[PDB]
Amino acid sequence: QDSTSDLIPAPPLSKVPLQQNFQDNQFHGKWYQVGRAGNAAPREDKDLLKMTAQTYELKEDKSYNVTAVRFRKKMCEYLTMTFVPGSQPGEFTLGNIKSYPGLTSYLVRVVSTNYNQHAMVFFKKVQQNREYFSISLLGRTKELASELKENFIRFSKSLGLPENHIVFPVPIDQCIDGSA
C-alpha cells in the first residue's frame, strides 16, 4: 500500500551554478520571495499567491536560522529552519533533520546574488522518497527589475520547468512587513 506521483526530474547539478566566493555576512537579513519555481504541483488556493518573506540570521557557528513568514487564512504563519554550511560556501544542509518526518535529504545552493538587491537560490530535497526541487528569486524589495524576472524564468526553463510551474507572488502588507 500507498501512492503514486509524477514529477519533473531534478536537474543535474552541472546545470545549477553556485555563486562564486559566497559571502555569508553579506547575505544575511530580510529577503522577499518575488518569484518561485519548482516541480511540486501548483496549488489552486489563490491565497497562496501572496508574497512571503524570509530572514537569514547568521549565527556565531556560521549556520543561519532562517525564518519565513506568510499571510495565510487570516493568520501570520512562521516557520524557522536551520541551514548548516554545506560542502562549498553558498551551500547548506538542514540542521536537526531527524525532527522532520519523512524528510531524508535537503540541500540549499545559492546560485547567484549581488547581496543588496536580488538572489536566486536552488533547493533540492527528498520527502517520502520523492525528489523535489525549487528555485527562489529573492528581492531586497518586494518588486524587482523585469530583467531579473526574465533571467529567473529562463534559468527555471533551463532546469526543465514549464511556465505553469513558475510564479510571481503578489506583494502584500500583512505579516511580511508587520505594522505601520
Task: Figure out which of the listed residues 8, 18, 68, 172 binds ligand LIZ, where binding follows CB under 6 A.
Answer: 68
Site for ligand LIZ (CB under 6 A): which residue of 19, 54, 113, 156? 54
36 lies in the site for ligand LIZ, by CB under 6 A: yes
Q: Residue 134 CB, nearest distance to ligand LIZ (Å)?
A: 6
Instruction: Look up cell 533571467; give the residue.
Output: 151
Residue 55 near residue 67, CB atoms below 8 Å: yes
Identify residues 98-117 at the interface with ligand LIZ (CB under 6 A). none
Looking at the DSSP assignment, which residues form a beta bridge with residue 121? 110, 136
**Are the C-beta atoms of 95 and 63 separated by less than 8 Å?**
yes
Task: Categorise residue 141: left if φ over 0, alpha if ψ from -120 to 50, beta otherwise.
Answer: beta
Pairing of strands 29-38, 103-113: unpaired
| Among 8, 18, 81, 84, contact with ligand LIZ (rule: CB under 6 A) | 81
Q: Left (φ > 0), alpha (ψ -120 to 50) or beta: where does 126 sit? A: beta
**Residue among 16, 70, 110, 122 that touches ligand LIZ (CB under 6 A):** 70
Q: Which is nearer to ligand LIZ, 66 or 148 (CB)?
A: 66
- Which residues would be at the binding site for ligand LIZ (CB under 6 A)? 33, 36, 52, 54, 66, 68, 70, 77, 79, 81, 121, 123, 134, 136
